[PDB]
Design a protein around this ligand. Structure first.
Ligand SMILES: Nc1nc2c([nH]c(=O)n2[C@@H]2O[C@H](COP(=O)(O)OP(=O)(O)OP(=O)(O)O)[C@@H](O)[C@H]2O)c(=O)[nH]1
Ligand SMILES: [Cl-]
Ligand SMILES: [Mn+2]
Ligand SMILES: [Mn+2]
Ligand SMILES: [Mn+2]
Ligand SMILES: [Mn+2]
Ligand SMILES: [Mn+2]
Ligand code: NA
Ligand code: NA
Ligand code: NA
Length: 326
DNA sequence: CCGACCGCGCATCAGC
DNA sequence: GCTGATGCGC
DNA sequence: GTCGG
């Protein structure tokens, strides 16, 4: 909010390059600039003041100057007028409709929430569920509701097998007041980097959650990752809780801390941390952290006793999950 | 000026 | 039936 | 779009 005017302008330009222009590296450049601006202590009064920041070049600087002088920007304003640009921008809001499927729909004459409803035969399962809970998914979850889901989920996993360990991560683990979805990390001692000694490990947990009438739908489902929809219970005819997105990822137990680091966030923070890993001779992943010599190929995974242990390898001062949201 | 911008799981589909 | 390319969300 | 090289 200190510079929300610039960030919101850089954010919309980021989503325009990703959904319409399909230039993912411009989308990342705008997001990297909007993030480093959102952490700037002083109030931005110059485009030249912004270009000193890492991630803000000349073109964004003049875009910033044009904003501070007028309160608007002609580039973004003309994109808002473009019917096809705004139609693709809206179609991508449906989960499962990416930049390519959205553009194909627009060239076919499908560009509204009803147009998608009339052509439900053209959408796959993930896209229909995204259509079904379009409004519910745009709503975000207060942390108080997240705590109810945390205890619903963490108790349902030990109903199946008390040697289950579920860790709610993501925005919730970063201490956010309200969250877009729920990200669950699940471990079982019979699943490690060397062998899987029990099958249906993730399946048993997903099946139990929907027997309690928690999980309502399934977007993706495999042996390791589950993407679906959940819902809190309601009593005494109170207005039903809105449906929420939930992701469940079963992880090797011996790779727990690198996965907690990878699925805590933020996505911009993990990117900057991973980039600074090769800066010092390591490669950080959702599973491992392998050293880098001169081979150009990663070495064997390193012992990781903590989440701070990964910080220690690249000699980064440990940052609590609350300060990892960038 | 210039190339490098992370890497994973799952679904769908074309081609066989 | 299968494998590979690709889209998608992260 | 940005920046290290
Ligand atoms: N590899 C990779 N991981 C990502 C990306 N984006 C992204 O959010 N993640 C990881 O995915 C985890 C959860 O994704 P998410 O959509 O729930 O984002 P979030 O929890 O930070 O925010 P939110 O749930 O409040 O909307 C994050 O901890 C993050 O590390 C990405 O683009 N690439
Ligand atoms: Cl270039
Ligand atoms: Mn119509
Ligand atoms: Mn989200
Ligand atoms: Mn999340
Ligand atoms: Mn609903
Ligand atoms: Mn240690
Ligand atoms: Na700069
Ligand atoms: Na989408
Ligand atoms: Na997620």
């Amino acid at each position: 909010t200190l510079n929300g005017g610039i960030t919101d302008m850089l954010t919309e330009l980021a989503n325009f390059e990703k959904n319409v222009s399909q230039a993912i590296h411009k989308y990342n450049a705008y997001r990297k600039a909007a993030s480093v601006i959102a952490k700037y202590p002083h109030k931005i009064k110059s485009g030249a003041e912004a270009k000193k920041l890492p991630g803000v070049g000349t073109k964004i600087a003049e875009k910033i100057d044009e904003f501070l002088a007028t309160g608007k920007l002609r580039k973004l304003e003309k994109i808002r007028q473009d019917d096809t640009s705004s139609s693709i921008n809206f179609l991508t809001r449906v989960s499962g409709i990416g930049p390519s499927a959205a553009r194909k729909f627009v060239d076919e004459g499908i560009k509204t929430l009803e147009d998608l409803r009339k052509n439900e035969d053209k959408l796959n399962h993930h896209q229909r569920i995204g259509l079904k809970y379009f409004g519910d998914f745009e709503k975000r979850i207060p942390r108080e509701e997240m705590l109810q889901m945390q205890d619903i989920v963490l108790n349902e996993v030990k109903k199946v097998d008390s040697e289950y360990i579920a860790t709610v991560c993501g925005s919730f683990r970063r201490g956010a007041e309200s969250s877009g979805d729920m990200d669950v990390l699940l471990t079982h001692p019979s699943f490690t980097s060397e062998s899987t000694k029990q099958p249906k490990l993730l399946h048993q947990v997903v099946e139990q959650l929907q027997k309690v009438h928690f999980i309502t739908d399934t977007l993706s489902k495999g042996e390791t990752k589950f993407m679906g929809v959940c819902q809190l219970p309601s009593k005494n005819d109170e207005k039903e809780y809105p449906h929420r997105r939930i992701d469940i990822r079963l992880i090797p137990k011996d790779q727990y801390y690198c996965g907690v680091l990878g699925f805590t966030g933020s996505d911009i923070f993990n990117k900057n941390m991973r980039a600074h890993a090769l800066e010092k001779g390591f490669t950080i992943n959702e599973y491992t952290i392998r050293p880098l010599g001169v081979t150009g190929v990663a070495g064997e995974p390193l012992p990781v006793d903590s989440e701070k242990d990964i910080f220690d390898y690249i000699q980064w001062k440990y940052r609590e999950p609350k300060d990892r949201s960038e």
